[model samples]
Target: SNTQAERSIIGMIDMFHKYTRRDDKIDKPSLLTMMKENFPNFLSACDKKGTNYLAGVFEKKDKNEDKKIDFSEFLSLMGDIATDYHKKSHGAAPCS
Candidate 1:
């Protein structure tokens, strides 16, 4: 289950990048709307208390207040997301 969860998180991050990098013009609002419409469950799964910290990255890069994230900003956001996910998933105490 741990491995599966890890893989899911990676896949989710990858998908987020892939969508954000699309050739078609995608603004921040559109990007967020798309994620909400398509990945509602994934968004819900990320509702932990600390998740807001991760969400802030997305909000910051969404310049112009368009609600869609640009490629560069999305990449930066992904980096933070991956790092946080790694810490949370691996930071649990080891069994004695």
Candidate 2:
């Protein structure tokens, strides 16, 4: 009986496991590929909506110089989207 948020949480957990495999953290290419595969719709909002627009997004979200995104970092990544979604639900535009 998972709710929408719960389901999203489960899905991201699976995604991290699948993409990370041995490392327990998503490396740069894995993160890029995961983002490309999982979030085409999320990416569509960008004014450019292509690889160019996404070029720095990974760096912007990493929040550390570790060169990989762990599950903790992953939650922070999703938190930005969640924050904007809440803002829009309250009748404001989503911020990037």
Candidate 3:
């Protein structure tokens, strides 16, 4: 388990740029659409848990309060997905 799990990390980074939009940032609608298309499992899991992230994704990911999701914010969303997966995996909680 100590190994890098390299491909997944690169895949995620690749997936991030797949959704990369103008202004080097993702707007509300586009990012959500991208997530549904790209990161469907995470979106579904979060939805199933009644997590309000799909909307607040823009709200929350806007760390600078810019109403935009830059690359860093996108990675944060990825982290959130991973965080929820870990929680669910260990039976700590779902993604609320």
Candidate 4:
């Protein structure tokens, strides 16, 4: 199961663990940090300036408003980013 897609999935899981706290959820600043570190290009592509991109995103991703992003919420965010990148591969810009 070491295919490219499988490895990518594992990478996502590992990335989540890298930022998750003791309770297994990623908090606001952590989420912002992870995004900035992991998706600098994606952020630029979306025209997101500085670290404020997570300004409204954290709220949306936290379905329970618990102030943290659980694994499920994290996966949803990944899904969104993947969708945008997929579109980019099709020659369309992200989130536009």
Best by TM-score: 4
RMSD of 4: 2.4
Q: Give the least accurate 10-residue stretch of model 2, judged by summed lDDT.
A: 45-54
Candidate 1: tens digits of C-alpha lDDT, residues 58-87:
567766666666656666655654565566
Q: Across residues 2-88, which tens digit of lDDT does each residue of candidate 4 receive? A: 999899889999999999989999999999999989998888866653344556888989999989999999999999888888887
Per-residue lDDT tens digits for candidate 2, residues 5-60, read 99977887998888885779888788778877887666665545333445876787
lDDT of 3: 0.76
Better of 2 and 4 by TM-score: 4
Model 3: per-residue lDDT, tens digit, 13-52?
7776766675677778878888789777766766787875
lDDT (CA) for every model shown?
0.57, 0.74, 0.76, 0.87
How does candidate 4 score on lDDT?
Answer: 0.87
Clashing pairs in 2: none
Ranking by TM-score: 4, 3, 2, 1
- Residue 27, candidate 4: C-alpha displacement in angstroms: 0.4
Better of 1 and 2 by TM-score: 2
lDDT of model number 2: 0.74
Clash-forming residue pairs, model 4 = none
